[PDB]
Design a protein around this motif. Structure first.
Motif, PDB file in Angstrom:
ATOM      1  N   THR A 195     -53.460  16.420 -25.681  1.00  0.00           N
ATOM      2  CA  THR A 195     -53.109  17.091 -24.370  1.00  0.00           C
ATOM      3  C   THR A 195     -52.012  18.078 -24.507  1.00  0.00           C
ATOM      4  O   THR A 195     -51.167  18.191 -25.389  1.00  0.00           O
ATOM      5  N   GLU A 196     -52.198  19.393 -23.658  1.00  0.00           N
ATOM      6  CA  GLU A 196     -51.279  20.268 -23.763  1.00  0.00           C
ATOM      7  C   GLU A 196     -49.756  19.856 -23.755  1.00  0.00           C
ATOM      8  O   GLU A 196     -49.818  19.097 -22.794  1.00  0.00           O
ATOM      9  N   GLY A 197     -48.855  20.787 -24.086  1.00  0.00           N
ATOM     10  CA  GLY A 197     -47.568  20.355 -23.795  1.00  0.00           C
ATOM     11  C   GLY A 197     -46.657  19.482 -24.926  1.00  0.00           C
ATOM     12  O   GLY A 197     -47.098  19.623 -25.840  1.00  0.00           O
ATOM     13  N   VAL A 198     -45.748  18.884 -24.433  1.00  0.00           N
ATOM     14  CA  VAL A 198     -44.961  18.009 -25.233  1.00  0.00           C
ATOM     15  C   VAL A 198     -45.665  17.282 -25.952  1.00  0.00           C
ATOM     16  O   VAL A 198     -46.842  16.594 -25.563  1.00  0.00           O
ATOM     17  N   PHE A 199     -45.272  16.689 -27.090  1.00  0.00           N
ATOM     18  CA  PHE A 199     -46.104  15.828 -28.169  1.00  0.00           C
ATOM     19  C   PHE A 199     -45.994  14.313 -28.048  1.00  0.00           C
ATOM     20  O   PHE A 199     -45.027  13.651 -27.507  1.00  0.00           O
ATOM     21  N   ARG A 200     -47.069  13.772 -28.330  1.00  0.00           N
ATOM     22  CA  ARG A 200     -47.217  12.362 -28.701  1.00  0.00           C
ATOM     23  C   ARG A 200     -48.124  11.924 -29.909  1.00  0.00           C
ATOM     24  O   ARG A 200     -48.892  13.063 -30.409  1.00  0.00           O
ATOM     25  N   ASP A 206     -50.670  -2.055 -40.741  1.00  0.00           N
ATOM     26  CA  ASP A 206     -50.996  -3.358 -41.435  1.00  0.00           C
ATOM     27  C   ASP A 206     -50.519  -4.540 -40.481  1.00  0.00           C
ATOM     28  O   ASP A 206     -51.218  -5.617 -40.408  1.00  0.00           O
ATOM     29  N   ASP A 207     -49.670  -4.219 -39.404  1.00  0.00           N
ATOM     30  CA  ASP A 207     -49.098  -5.093 -38.460  1.00  0.00           C
ATOM     31  C   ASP A 207     -50.046  -5.663 -37.223  1.00  0.00           C
ATOM     32  O   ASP A 207     -49.744  -6.174 -36.428  1.00  0.00           O
ATOM     33  N   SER A 208     -51.185  -4.965 -37.226  1.00  0.00           N
ATOM     34  CA  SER A 208     -52.149  -5.450 -36.411  1.00  0.00           C
ATOM     35  C   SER A 208     -52.198  -4.490 -34.985  1.00  0.00           C
ATOM     36  O   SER A 208     -52.873  -4.744 -33.984  1.00  0.00           O
ATOM     37  N   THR A 209     -51.408  -3.417 -35.020  1.00  0.00           N
ATOM     38  CA  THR A 209     -50.989  -2.628 -33.783  1.00  0.00           C
ATOM     39  C   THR A 209     -51.256  -1.394 -33.883  1.00  0.00           C
ATOM     40  O   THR A 209     -51.342  -0.810 -35.075  1.00  0.00           O
ATOM     41  N   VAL A 210     -51.483  -0.889 -32.693  1.00  0.00           N
ATOM     42  CA  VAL A 210     -51.668   0.774 -32.633  1.00  0.00           C
ATOM     43  C   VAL A 210     -50.605   1.259 -31.870  1.00  0.00           C
ATOM     44  O   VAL A 210     -50.346   0.566 -30.719  1.00  0.00           O
ATOM     45  N   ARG A 211     -49.412   1.953 -32.208  1.00  0.00           N
ATOM     46  CA  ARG A 211     -48.160   2.623 -31.256  1.00  0.00           C
ATOM     47  C   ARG A 211     -48.665   3.676 -30.761  1.00  0.00           C
ATOM     48  O   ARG A 211     -49.334   4.679 -31.286  1.00  0.00           O
ATOM     49  N   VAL A 212     -48.067   4.257 -29.645  1.00  0.00           N
ATOM     50  CA  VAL A 212     -48.040   5.508 -29.121  1.00  0.00           C
ATOM     51  C   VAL A 212     -46.445   5.971 -29.110  1.00  0.00           C
ATOM     52  O   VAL A 212     -45.741   5.008 -28.414  1.00  0.00           O
ATOM     53  N   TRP A 213     -46.248   7.011 -29.621  1.00  0.00           N
ATOM     54  CA  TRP A 213     -45.051   7.545 -29.906  1.00  0.00           C
ATOM     55  C   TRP A 213     -44.982   8.796 -28.983  1.00  0.00           C
ATOM     56  O   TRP A 213     -45.869   9.647 -29.006  1.00  0.00           O
ATOM     57  N   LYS A 214     -43.933   8.776 -28.371  1.00  0.00           N
ATOM     58  CA  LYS A 214     -43.459   9.989 -27.382  1.00  0.00           C
ATOM     59  C   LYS A 214     -42.240  10.884 -28.004  1.00  0.00           C
ATOM     60  O   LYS A 214     -41.219  10.529 -28.164  1.00  0.00           O
ATOM     61  N   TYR A 215     -42.452  12.198 -28.006  1.00  0.00           N
ATOM     62  CA  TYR A 215     -41.385  13.095 -28.069  1.00  0.00           C
ATOM     63  C   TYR A 215     -40.481  13.293 -26.923  1.00  0.00           C
ATOM     64  O   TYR A 215     -41.025  13.245 -25.881  1.00  0.00           O
ATOM     65  N   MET A 216     -39.181  13.116 -27.202  1.00  0.00           N
ATOM     66  CA  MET A 216     -38.207  13.078 -26.071  1.00  0.00           C
ATOM     67  C   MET A 216     -37.124  14.157 -26.227  1.00  0.00           C
ATOM     68  O   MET A 216     -35.882  14.096 -25.695  1.00  0.00           O
ATOM     69  N   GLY A 217     -37.324  15.274 -26.766  1.00  0.00           N
ATOM     70  CA  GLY A 217     -36.682  16.609 -27.066  1.00  0.00           C
ATOM     71  C   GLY A 217     -35.861  16.459 -28.454  1.00  0.00           C
ATOM     72  O   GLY A 217     -35.812  15.413 -28.927  1.00  0.00           O
ATOM     73  N   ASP A 218     -35.464  17.883 -28.630  1.00  0.00           N
ATOM     74  CA  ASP A 218     -34.620  17.926 -29.926  1.00  0.00           C
ATOM     75  C   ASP A 218     -33.181  17.507 -29.597  1.00  0.00           C
ATOM     76  O   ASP A 218     -32.674  17.566 -28.402  1.00  0.00           O
ATOM     77  N   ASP A 219     -32.415  16.630 -30.501  1.00  0.00           N
ATOM     78  CA  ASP A 219     -31.079  16.437 -30.631  1.00  0.00           C
ATOM     79  C   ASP A 219     -30.163  17.851 -30.946  1.00  0.00           C
ATOM     80  O   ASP A 219     -30.773  18.475 -31.081  1.00  0.00           O
ATOM     81  N   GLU A 220     -28.910  17.878 -31.067  1.00  0.00           N
ATOM     82  CA  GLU A 220     -27.957  18.792 -31.306  1.00  0.00           C
ATOM     83  C   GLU A 220     -28.174  19.368 -32.465  1.00  0.00           C
ATOM     84  O   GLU A 220     -27.653  20.628 -32.754  1.00  0.00           O
ATOM     85  N   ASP A 221     -28.606  18.534 -33.415  1.00  0.00           N
ATOM     86  CA  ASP A 221     -28.920  18.968 -34.869  1.00  0.00           C
ATOM     87  C   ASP A 221     -30.138  19.819 -35.252  1.00  0.00           C
ATOM     88  O   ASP A 221     -30.389  19.870 -36.344  1.00  0.00           O
ATOM     89  N   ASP A 222     -31.020  19.698 -34.151  1.00  0.00           N
ATOM     90  CA  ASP A 222     -32.287  20.089 -34.007  1.00  0.00           C
ATOM     91  C   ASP A 222     -33.349  19.363 -34.784  1.00  0.00           C
ATOM     92  O   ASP A 222     -34.447  19.844 -35.133  1.00  0.00           O
ATOM     93  N   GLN A 223     -32.935  18.044 -34.585  1.00  0.00           N
ATOM     94  CA  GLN A 223     -33.750  17.002 -35.258  1.00  0.00           C
ATOM     95  C   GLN A 223     -34.604  16.545 -33.873  1.00  0.00           C
ATOM     96  O   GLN A 223     -34.189  16.917 -32.668  1.00  0.00           O
ATOM     97  N   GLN A 224     -35.669  15.882 -33.979  1.00  0.00           N
ATOM     98  CA  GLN A 224     -36.430  15.708 -32.962  1.00  0.00           C
ATOM     99  C   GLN A 224     -36.217  13.861 -32.652  1.00  0.00           C
ATOM    100  O   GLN A 224     -36.187  13.162 -33.416  1.00  0.00           O
ATOM    101  N   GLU A 225     -36.001  13.698 -31.178  1.00  0.00           N
ATOM    102  CA  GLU A 225     -35.852  12.372 -30.660  1.00  0.00           C
ATOM    103  C   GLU A 225     -37.232  11.979 -30.452  1.00  0.00           C
ATOM    104  O   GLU A 225     -37.990  12.528 -29.479  1.00  0.00           O
ATOM    105  N   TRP A 226     -37.518  10.734 -30.788  1.00  0.00           N
ATOM    106  CA  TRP A 226     -39.042  10.190 -30.733  1.00  0.00           C
ATOM    107  C   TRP A 226     -38.756   8.719 -30.186  1.00  0.00           C
ATOM    108  O   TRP A 226     -37.901   7.985 -30.991  1.00  0.00           O
ATOM    109  N   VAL A 227     -39.673   8.105 -29.329  1.00  0.00           N
ATOM    110  CA  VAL A 227     -39.583   6.586 -29.127  1.00  0.00           C
ATOM    111  C   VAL A 227     -40.952   6.160 -29.153  1.00  0.00           C
ATOM    112  O   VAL A 227     -41.725   6.832 -29.045  1.00  0.00           O
ATOM    113  N   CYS A 228     -41.040   4.936 -29.353  1.00  0.00           N
ATOM    114  CA  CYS A 228     -42.725   4.229 -29.191  1.00  0.00           C
ATOM    115  C   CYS A 228     -42.658   4.021 -27.753  1.00  0.00           C
ATOM    116  O   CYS A 228     -41.781   3.177 -27.315  1.00  0.00           O
TER     117      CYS A 228
END
Ligand SMILES: [Ca+2]
Length: 308
Positions: A195-200, A206-228
């Motif tokens: 999908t165009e735009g912000v990332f997922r 091994d844990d038997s799952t598929v996770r979908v993670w979503k980018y939630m913007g950069d933090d103050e230190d130019d690191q990326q905030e991401w959540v499942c």
């Protein structure tokens, strides 16, 4: 419904990796030899075998330099080979390698290893010479897989340390900008949302799952905030060895259990779109790609091609 359109036996040993570009599927197995298959929905045929004892141990990973006919191959050897082209001519050796993957601009080749690192190599239009520009050592265990975003110079590595790491550069200073913590066992692979735009990103474990993670913007230190943001519905019983996120929006997963599943996101929720059991008979399935149709590669040395 998932329908078998064609079943192609290529080796007598595991298929670990494959990649499609310009109507050609490249494959890797416990074998020295790399096999190339012409693919159309006619199709579906052997065209070349790449060897020349380059070629010492299992070919764990193959990837095409995107929209081109130059190929990279990484090996349990600790080495990575480069081919160009009918016929394919060798070009270089670069120095267990678990994965190879190209940026979509075609200039960067990432490699990953049992040695816990990710290397970034740079080349030019010609793909002849390789310069190591970064050596990325943050994972604490065996790195299983690397993949780049479809259109940004963003790289995802998946590891036996149970994390996915996201890597980004500022003027060739490559560093880790996020650690995706949540899986409870080895992460075998990941793939970015098309999908165009912000990332997922989706990842399979091994844990038997598929996770979908979503980018939630950069933090103050130019690191990326991401959540499942989601765990997909139950399918596998359960190492999930490969996932693939198509331009059609659909995720595919395959597992040790021999199941191929497809998932669709509607109204902000994921559902199993289709699934099929015993896709490689009694055999573990290691790899899946969206070609639109599906290819699966299994421990029986077969590439099955499926229609949706
Ligand atoms: Ca599960």
């Amino acid at each position: 419904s998932i329908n078998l359109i064609k079943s192609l036996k290529l080796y007598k040993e595991k298929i670990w990796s494959f990649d499609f570009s310009q109507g050609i599927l490249a494959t890797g197995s416990t074998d020295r030899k790399i096999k190339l298959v012409s693919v159309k929905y006619d199709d579906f045929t052997l065209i070349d075998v790449l060897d020349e004892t380059a070629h010492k141990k299992a070919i764990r990973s193959v990837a095409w330099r995107p929209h081109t006919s130059l190929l990279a191959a990484g090996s349990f050897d600790s080495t990575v080979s480069i081919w160009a082209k009918f016929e394919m001519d060798l070009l270089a050796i670069i120095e267990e390698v678990k994965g190879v993957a190209w940026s979509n601009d075609g200039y960067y080749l990432a490699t990953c290893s049992r040695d816990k690192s990710v290397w970034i190599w740079e080349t030019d239009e010609s793909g002849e010479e390789y310069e190591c520009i970064s050596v990325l050592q943050e994972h604490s265990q065996d790195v299983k897989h690397v993949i780049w975003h479809p259109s940004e110079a963003l790289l995802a590595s998946s590891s036996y340390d149970d994390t996915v790491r996201i890597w980004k550069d500022y003027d060739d200073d490559w560093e880790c900008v996020a650690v995706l913590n949540g899986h409870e066992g080895t992460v075998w692979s990941s793939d970015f949302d098309k999908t165009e735009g912000v990332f997922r990103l989706c990842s399979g474990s091994d844990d038997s799952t598929v996770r979908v993670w979503k980018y939630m913007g950069d933090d103050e230190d130019d690191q990326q905030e991401w959540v499942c943001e989601a765990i997909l519905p139950d399918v596998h019983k359960r190492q999930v060895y490969n996932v693939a996120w198509g331009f059609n929006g659909l995720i595919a997963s395959v597992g040790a259990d021999g199941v191929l599943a497809v998932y669709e996101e509607v109204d902000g929720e994921w559902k199993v779109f289709a699934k099929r059991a015993l896709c490689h008979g009694v055999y573990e399935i290691n790899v899946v790609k969206w070609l639109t149709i599906l290819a699966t590669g299994g421990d029986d040395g077969i590439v099955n091609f499926w229609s949706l």
